Design a protein around this ligand. Sequence first.
Ligand SMILES: CC(=O)SCCNC(=O)CCNC(=O)[C@H](O)C(C)(C)COP(=O)(O)OP(=O)(O)OC[C@H]1O[C@@H](n2cnc3c(N)ncnc32)[C@H](O)[C@@H]1OP(=O)(O)O
Ligand SMILES: CC(=O)SCCNC(=O)CCNC(=O)[C@H](O)C(C)(C)COP(=O)(O)OP(=O)(O)OC[C@H]1O[C@@H](n2cnc3c(N)ncnc32)[C@H](O)[C@@H]1OP(=O)(O)O
Ligand SMILES: CC(=O)SCCNC(=O)CCNC(=O)[C@H](O)C(C)(C)COP(=O)(O)OP(=O)(O)OC[C@H]1O[C@@H](n2cnc3c(N)ncnc32)[C@H](O)[C@@H]1OP(=O)(O)O
Ligand SMILES: CC(=O)SCCNC(=O)CCNC(=O)[C@H](O)C(C)(C)COP(=O)(O)OP(=O)(O)OC[C@H]1O[C@@H](n2cnc3c(N)ncnc32)[C@H](O)[C@@H]1OP(=O)(O)O
Lengths: 390, 390, 390, 390
Amino acid sequence: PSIVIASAARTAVGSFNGAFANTPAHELGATVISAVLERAGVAAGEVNEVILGQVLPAGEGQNPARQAAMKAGVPQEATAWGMNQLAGSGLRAVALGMQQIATGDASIIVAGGMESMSMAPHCAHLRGGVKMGDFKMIDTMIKDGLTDAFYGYHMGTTAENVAKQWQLSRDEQDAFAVASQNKAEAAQKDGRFKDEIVPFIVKGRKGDITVDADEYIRHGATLDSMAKLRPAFDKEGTVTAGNASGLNDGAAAALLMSEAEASRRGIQPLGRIVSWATVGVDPKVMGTGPIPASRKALERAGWKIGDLDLVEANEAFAAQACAVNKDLGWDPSIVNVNGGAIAIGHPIGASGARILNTLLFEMKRRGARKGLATLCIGGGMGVAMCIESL
Amino acid sequence: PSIVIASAARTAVGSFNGAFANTPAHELGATVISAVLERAGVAAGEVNEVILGQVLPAGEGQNPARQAAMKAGVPQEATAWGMNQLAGSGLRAVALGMQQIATGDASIIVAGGMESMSMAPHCAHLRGGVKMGDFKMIDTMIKDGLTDAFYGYHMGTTAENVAKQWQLSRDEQDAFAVASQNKAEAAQKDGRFKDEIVPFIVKGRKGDITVDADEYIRHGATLDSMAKLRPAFDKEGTVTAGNASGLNDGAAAALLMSEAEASRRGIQPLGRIVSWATVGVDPKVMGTGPIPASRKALERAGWKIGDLDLVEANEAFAAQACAVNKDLGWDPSIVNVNGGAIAIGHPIGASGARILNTLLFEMKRRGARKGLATLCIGGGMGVAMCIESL
Amino acid sequence: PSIVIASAARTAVGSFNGAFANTPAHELGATVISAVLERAGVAAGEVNEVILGQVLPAGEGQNPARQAAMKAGVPQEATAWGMNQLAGSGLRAVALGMQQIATGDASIIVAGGMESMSMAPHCAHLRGGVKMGDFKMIDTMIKDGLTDAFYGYHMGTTAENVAKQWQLSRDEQDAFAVASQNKAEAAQKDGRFKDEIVPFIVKGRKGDITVDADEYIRHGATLDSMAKLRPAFDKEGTVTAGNASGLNDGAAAALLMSEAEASRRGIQPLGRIVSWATVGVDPKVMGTGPIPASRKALERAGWKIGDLDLVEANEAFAAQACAVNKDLGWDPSIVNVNGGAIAIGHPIGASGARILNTLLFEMKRRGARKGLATLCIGGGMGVAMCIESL
Amino acid sequence: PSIVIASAARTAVGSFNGAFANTPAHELGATVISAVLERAGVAAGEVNEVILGQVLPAGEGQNPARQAAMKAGVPQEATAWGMNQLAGSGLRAVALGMQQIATGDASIIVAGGMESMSMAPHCAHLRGGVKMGDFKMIDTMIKDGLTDAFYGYHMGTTAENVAKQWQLSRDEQDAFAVASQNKAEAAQKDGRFKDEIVPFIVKGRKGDITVDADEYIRHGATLDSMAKLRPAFDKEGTVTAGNASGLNDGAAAALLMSEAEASRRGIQPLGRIVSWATVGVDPKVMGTGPIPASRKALERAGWKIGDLDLVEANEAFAAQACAVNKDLGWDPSIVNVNGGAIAIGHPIGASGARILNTLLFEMKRRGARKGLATLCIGGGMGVAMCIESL
Ligand SMILES: CC(=O)SCCNC(=O)CCNC(=O)[C@H](O)C(C)(C)COP(=O)(O)OP(=O)(O)OC[C@H]1O[C@@H](n2cnc3c(N)ncnc32)[C@H](O)[C@@H]1OP(=O)(O)O
Ligand SMILES: CC(=O)SCCNC(=O)CCNC(=O)[C@H](O)C(C)(C)COP(=O)(O)OP(=O)(O)OC[C@H]1O[C@@H](n2cnc3c(N)ncnc32)[C@H](O)[C@@H]1OP(=O)(O)O
Ligand SMILES: CC(=O)SCCNC(=O)CCNC(=O)[C@H](O)C(C)(C)COP(=O)(O)OP(=O)(O)OC[C@H]1O[C@@H](n2cnc3c(N)ncnc32)[C@H](O)[C@@H]1OP(=O)(O)O
Ligand SMILES: CC(=O)SCCNC(=O)CCNC(=O)[C@H](O)C(C)(C)COP(=O)(O)OP(=O)(O)OC[C@H]1O[C@@H](n2cnc3c(N)ncnc32)[C@H](O)[C@@H]1OP(=O)(O)O
């Protein structure tokens, strides 16, 4: 089996309670679904299944993947499901879809992720009844997204642990963050994100608004402004809101089919999926996940690390990002060339399809042959995928 | 590629706010994961991944499937993820596991489902705030489990749609339900759930309790107690509390590996998976999903309906189940031989694994060579899987 | 001016989530208003104002006093208002009614209090929105009723403060508590609450229930059952659920007019109000409020402590009740002759009026000439009223 | 007894979720208490009681009036209590305060009201429990403040009832409303609210903000702006957001003592309370309440309507204000000379004190000898107070 990405698309990443503050994930989803269909010239009638990574579905109704697909125009006869491996989710969905094709179960799959961290509700278990006493309304975004289920503290605390292990100074984390911002503002301005982004129309009462730019990138980001910030978790620590990514909203998708199918339709694919791997690590240092993941995927692809021409490695925190780069030893000048999530944002279930978008379109534009996408995963996991240009 | 269910276990299904009223899904999940390992004689450290269907994860912490796997002693090295195709989630998880092993990405998978409908919280989106006026706190079990996203109404209203299209009377669904209650009562007393069920220890403060029996089945179920119930959804309707399944809690799972590996380990498998399928249908008549999904599966196995020795066809509603039997035309004496969900319970994300567990242990008990398991899915889909004993 | 109490009534006192669990305070209020009118031979058309103490009006609608008055058939031309001096409220309401008559602003007032602790809601401020992080749903009963606003701790902690300053042992508190129960039981069995109580009909769907007995009084209370309880507020503390009053529902009221008006009508009044007083104390030892208030009220009446024939002093906690008795030195045999709040219950806003009811019917029964009613108030206050028989 | 108002003060009236959006009512209250004291040259140690009207206390903690008094430095020996007769509260507190002094129960009282509509929580009764389905989180400001308890509709509907009975056109209402804005604007710019307002410091993390000006008054209000609005309550109705008052925060108070005590201390009082009255009306036309109350107060004073030099009549709705003016026949040019609540706001429990404040400082400024303050009250009441200058 030879499976290709025929097309891909993503929304802009919206800031917490910004452009997409009242926009449900399945609407962002539906827009990306329509985009990948139109970009490859495949009708929505020909899609067999839609697979979407989503971490925070509380309150959005039955199977939001099926809602995304129906709104996109996919017919009732196809199928649609969601899945959750946290930040890994959106890239893992892409691997799952490839498997559907490889085992002769489907011809054409749309896979990716969607998230609205904005729209995540607060909740409380209330059936028994609260006879006496205050009770907590729990923020589901914090509880289901950002808190370790075993140790009970924030993901940023695991970033703290990774920093300590690898002895990464505050100045090393800030300098990395300022580079990711500077790279991102540069790509934005030079038009390097227009290709991958499909504009979203936010319908309203007193006017439609078109959103086509990443609103979380901060312009003119400087080391001095990074150095002014207070530590955000450990009170004499090194992780801040400046060297960690944010809470964001968006969606992203790819259309997969067999190489042969693409050639029958005259489609020029963005890449062939050569290998993928998922691996587990200690949850206290979950940011190490991408290391055994990226190395296992490379092993499956039969490739050496120096064979890679481009990498996209999710930047949840500057700490885990510096460490991952240090261990694997690949050339920093080929990693996150258009910036990473510290700058662009981290819409969790979507992020893995997001970075895959960035990779595929950058690989197309510089003529790169081989690349890899990798992310760390809360609870101690990593996921990775190798991509080769045709 | 030939993939087999080495082993399988489920919990008793508990009634709503009943035995597992304060038990999170991942604990019921950890208990079945450990039982599949034990029953097979496989060490937890040999498990590559745990895949669990779960529909209602709100408030349960990051990646509940990872929480289940970790409490069951599966090492940190392994991976876990959750997925949602509503009531088909648990069956689909098994197929996804199968796929992991057939694409050469894994050796040993634990797959199934888990659900606590009792532990599901109420929620509201409150980030923008509520400037003025009343607002609703939403039941996430109804909103995310039992309400159609497209038309707005309860799943029982779809069952009513199918009762009118297939012209099924209230005496025909009442007859169906009592028969299911009688079949499930006779099975329980006969000892025929003992093998599949693993006891679960409810940890309390004033005493542990060991749950090893389904508590939702009602004994001595009469047609008159059925015929004295007012309709739940349509006031001139046929669907009532008694001819529809309940709200339940439980978990259900299966250990997957290749046939060659089952033989190297000296494991005699419960069955070989031969084909599966999912298909979509008109959401208004979602209960019909199992018709095309069973047909596609049966065709992907090269089988005729006639070949089948045993079928488990989830009874969400008597209306949908009466209708599926009518269209397919298999012998109703080989369907849900030990009762159905009307009797037993319908723990949504878990139900598809549940009915697989009953199918496998019954097929072994009687000596049946071929089995089909199938379920309808909210939003309008079906899933099915063909099993063959060795 | 001389103001009399022409008539008085109270409902039975309901247990927390017991007989009155779903009855709003204003329906209790209305039954008592009707009763005081009937008992005096005064028509509702003659009432000028209704004044009701009430601590916990949240969720009850606009001005519950007006709702109570209107339901009892008091004409729209009358006025009605609520007030809050915490447990002082129902007694203060009577002094405020007496003031409207003394200043010539009204002729006939109904005053007292009403409280539904069971029907108190939980609440949160949600207008600004909750951008990120958990929030508490606050129990309004605990927050508005039972928590000190200055120090942040439960009223039971101020009882601990008093026990420590007055060196009152757990043994002494428990004996006081068991004596309260035993006196209240005896009084109930002997019929001594019959006169003061007006029966309340709790309307239902499957039948009405009449409630005319205090349900919180525990029959056969033992010293062993007080002695086994654990401290409720301080782990080396002495105050327990046994030697504190409970959380309760009820209403109580009195009909006030000038002495000259009672004589024109041919009414035999229950008592003349001779004096009242309210004084502040340190919040930390609020249970001491009755000391300065009783002494002030006695000064104003021109009476010595030894002149009193009967005293009702509210027993919020055994600790403060004991301290009050010690400081004042009145003969304990004339205090709370029929038990107090430890046994009967403490429906906050109604209690001041409840104990006045008990005092007036007992004075009448035994022919006592001079009486005092007093209560402590959260936030550090005391209220007292001197009554003389005619 | 002759009782005088020695001094008075109010905060600026804040807009809904505006300047006081996170300021509890008791904080606003404490500032006004300190101000009346400072203005009269009376020490906090001399105050016997504080009486504060307040409609919406839910969530604020035990007895907010005590909390306000304590914050202002009134000694623990003094007493404090809240009351609620709706928009009547803040004026009625003054009359209650006058009564304490007239019956010789106190010498120095601070009386007024406070309200934070912004801080009013949402609530639900959750004790019994919510077994299944959605439930309502009720806005306490609307339920307890603005909804009639007998008919279930907004106060705005009662305004429509009045407009209908009195045949008041939309253009007459919109003219009154624009006049009220234009008079308030003029008075604000001329500095006529300076004397009555005490500045409130809103303590902020990143800077304090001093609030000394009424923020709800619209500058340059046009008739065309009123004329374009949609009816707010009845779809062919006449009452709009423009010709109704708003939802607002504020506090207001007066220091009261005997005329002879003022003389001893050398205080030139703002006024002598000559009479007061409260009367009920039909709830359906509650806006007519000022008519019978103002006539009763004038009767009790021995004054004809034409003896009055200045009137303050609260403007809940233009409709009722117009009705009141037409029935009473007072010269409209002496009524609400500096604008009314349509322009300044309506902080419910504080409103009656706010209008008293305005009346006293205007009477002083122009040398008017005879004044009257009156307001309508939800549930069908009126309150009125007559003042004479010394
Ligand atoms: C495997 C995984 O994927 S784990 C990853 C999952 N995602 C996460 O864990 C998210 C991690 N981040 C978070 O949880 C949150 O965004 C936090 C806690 C770090 C920050 O949240 P907040 O406390 O609300 O920080 P916020 O975004 O407001 O920033 C704080 C201040 O720093 C400023 N700031 C941040 N970055 C910069 C910068 N580069 N330059 C200058 N100023 C900056 C902001 O403007 C802000 O100022 P303000 O509050 O006066 O307006
Ligand atoms: C794709 C899919 O899978 S769609 C399927 C998804 N599943 C569902 O939608 C679940 C459908 N069922 C439901 O929603 C609910 O069970 C309902 C609304 C139908 C009824 O449940 P509830 O409203 O919570 O009521 P409850 O479970 O307490 O039972 C109601 C009454 O019927 C009685 N009852 C129900 N069945 C029977 C029976 N077979 N014999 C005798 N009595 C019965 C109960 O004992 C109870 O009686 P009571 O009022 O005298 O105490
Ligand atoms: C000025 C003023 O007014 S301040 C006063 C205001 N009012 C108050 O502060 C009320 C004080 N009391 C309270 O707040 C509460 O009732 C508390 C916290 C003390 C106890 O509340 P709860 O959690 O409902 O405890 P609860 O009433 O169920 O009692 C606990 C146990 O003690 C037992 N108990 C209580 N009294 C007795 C007794 N006399 N004999 C035997 N057992 C007893 C109960 O039966 C119960 O037993 P269980 O746990 O085995 O079932
Ligand atoms: C006896 C008694 O005391 S009963 C009195 C008790 N109080 C009440 O009953 C309160 C009555 N008022 C209310 O309930 C509310 O203020 C309402 C329902 C009338 C309006 O409230 P809201 O829903 O928040 O509407 P809002 O105040 O935003 O006004 C709506 C629009 O009209 C506009 N508007 C308001 N006043 C004016 C004006 N004078 N000129 C021009 N436009 C105006 C606003 O700017 C707003 O425009 P926008 O939303 O595009 O920015």
